[PDB]
Amino acid sequence: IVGGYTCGANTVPYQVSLNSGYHFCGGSLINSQWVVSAAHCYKSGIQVRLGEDNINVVEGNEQFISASKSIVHPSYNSNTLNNDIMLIKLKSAASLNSRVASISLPTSCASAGTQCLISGWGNTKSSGTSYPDVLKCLKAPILSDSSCKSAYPGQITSNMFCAGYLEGGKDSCQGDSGGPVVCSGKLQGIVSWGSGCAQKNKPGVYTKVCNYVSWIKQTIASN
Ligand SMILES: NC(=[NH2+])c1cc2c(I)cccc2s1
Ligand SMILES: [Ca+2]
Ligand SMILES: [Cl-]
Secondary structure: OEOOEEOOOOOOOOEEEEEOOOEEEEEEEOOOOEEEEOHHHOOOOOEEEEOOOOOOOOOOOOEEEEEEEEEEOOOOEOOOOEOOOEEEEEOOOOOOOOOOOOOEOOOOOOOOOOEEEEEEOOOOOOOOOOOOOOOEEEEEEEOOHHHHHHHOOOOOOOOEEEEOOOOOOOEOOOOOOOOEEEEOOEEEEEEEEOOOOOEOOEOEEEEEHHHOHHHHHHHHHOO
């Protein structure tokens, strides 16, 4: 997260870290046995780490659970990143409490102007590489579709939305992929892509979760 602030330990209880010997992506807990992340974060050997703040120190509250299966959306396109969503089923259910809790799925899509909270352990430099030890947060608004399409002509599909600042300076970045964009207590986005990080007129693009609720529900119901 570039230009963000330190969230505070366990203030984002639904945030998870996908780990394979190091942190490579973020995700969101939606019930005690399932997590939603980005399809481009897929790999084998994923351990889901819940209740984290400093990812390099065991401080207490952590729960390390292996993924039993990862379900990448069948129509995921890695060239355009259309349908960039993945569901992970945990080997055992997590113990939910105030530090580990699930986030709700939306019942309707969000409007331009909605202020949301984006979080993660990704890079904090637009020009460079600095990964933090603790979780970073950023409050950012959803932009209008015209501004988004004008910034990335020909690359935005109806399953994506832009959020951020056109002046640059504040944005999500590599390492934040798969993490949550929460607005009014509902999970509306998943960190997907962008041109560099925090560049002027190049906001972050996110997977539009409201378009996938029936799919998530049906898939969880059959697995
Ligand atoms: N500018 C951005 N919001 C992002 C830039 C990236 C990059 I560079 C890699 C992976 C994910 C993201 S999100
Ligand atoms: Ca830790
Ligand atoms: Cl267009």
